[model samples]
Target: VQTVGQWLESIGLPQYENHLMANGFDNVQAMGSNVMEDQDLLEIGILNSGHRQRILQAIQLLPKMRPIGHDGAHPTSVAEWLDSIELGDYTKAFLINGYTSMDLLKKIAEVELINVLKINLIGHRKRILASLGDR
Candidate 1:
């Protein structure tokens, strides 16, 4: 079990350690537990996308931490949103790559998903898009 401070250093976010703690994220688990959004990164003063994405990527590695997702209706917190999509393992992968919403999915190019999953995500993309369009 790694403390948030130790985990931050491990993930190269050590610089944010004290900063994050000062903002109520004393434990790395808070990021995951609190269902933080990517934009929230700026609020906490983690302005760099590289750092934010990296921080998000690492949060999943923590025990009980998971990707926050939202499908529009049941979408609320990080984990709940992700859980609503019911993407299973793919949901985890999405968060690892810094994505947390189907709305976010629409804004991205389809090819990148294929490259990451090593499989054609077009089918999945269509379904997701259709779902989004419905809302």
Candidate 2:
């Protein structure tokens, strides 16, 4: 599996794996998610300015591989994106409710999260919607 940890290793920044993974970035999709920012990495202990910038730039350059979608526009699985946003609890629910692809996810709105996905919590709904907009 091409995880965040493995990516870090590949990039020669393996030391930050603990900090990154501990903060919920278990995979490259999570790393690629805009939910994180320069300040976030700093908060997580990547204090070196150059290292932080390197990590950010490297994430942007991740090679589009098979696990990525055919169009290489989004992650192939919505579950990873959900997890990246810390809303992974709804993975099965989203899939069962017919929100099965990254392409379909772009169509999700607050109303869909509420009426269809049953993501009643305001924070969770906002988080999901905001992350979708990050693309």
Candidate 3:
């Protein structure tokens, strides 16, 4: 897959790639694996509403698993947060199985992370649990 930098250029927003990559969305898989909401773009430093709208429009055309425009209240931002915490390796497993709710993620237990999500590493589970606590 192309890096998010290339994808942004293709969609006419290459200038914002540095900001996005700095926020941990360097690759296309990471971008496409979860729902990319307007708030997410804003958090990544796309301050211009026009630019944010353009990118959100382009995300609809991306070859991604999740659909665009979910309920505003529950945006399913799990993948982005996962990447931010450096546990992006399982983003796919989470997305593919519809485990993309931030609310649900915050409540996930260690046993669930291990048995259900297959996050086998004890350290990884601890990190996730710890991060969830802070969030």
Query: Which residue pairs in candidate 2 have backbone atoms (N, alpha carbon, C) closer than 3 angstroms, thus clashing?
Result: none
Residue-wise C-alpha lDDT for candidate 2, range 75-131, written one tens digit per residue: 558787776665677888888899877778777665766788875543354456556
In candidate 3, what are the lDDT values of residues 11-73, reduced to their tens digit? 885787777666656655444334466666765676566777778888876755445634222
Q: Is candidate 1 or candidate 3 better by lDDT?
A: 3
Model 2 regions more than 4 Å off: 32-36, 65-131
- List, residue by residue over 60-100, the lDDT tens digit for candidate 1: 55466335543245554335554544345566676777776
Q: Which regions of candidate 3 fall more than 4 Å away from where they truly are?
A: 65-135
RMSD of 2: 7.6
What order do candidates take by lDDT, descending? 2, 3, 1
Lowest summed lDDT window (length 10), candidate 1: 121-130
lDDT of 1: 0.54
In model 2, how large is the Cα lDDT of residue 43? Answer: 60
Backbone clashes in model 2: 0
Q: What does the lDDT read for residue 123 in candidate 2? A: 39
Number of the predicted model whose lDDT against the real structure is largest: 2
Residue 105 lDDT, candidate 3, scale 0-100 = 74
Cα RMSD (Å) per model? 14.0, 7.6, 11.5
Clashes of each: 3, 0, 0
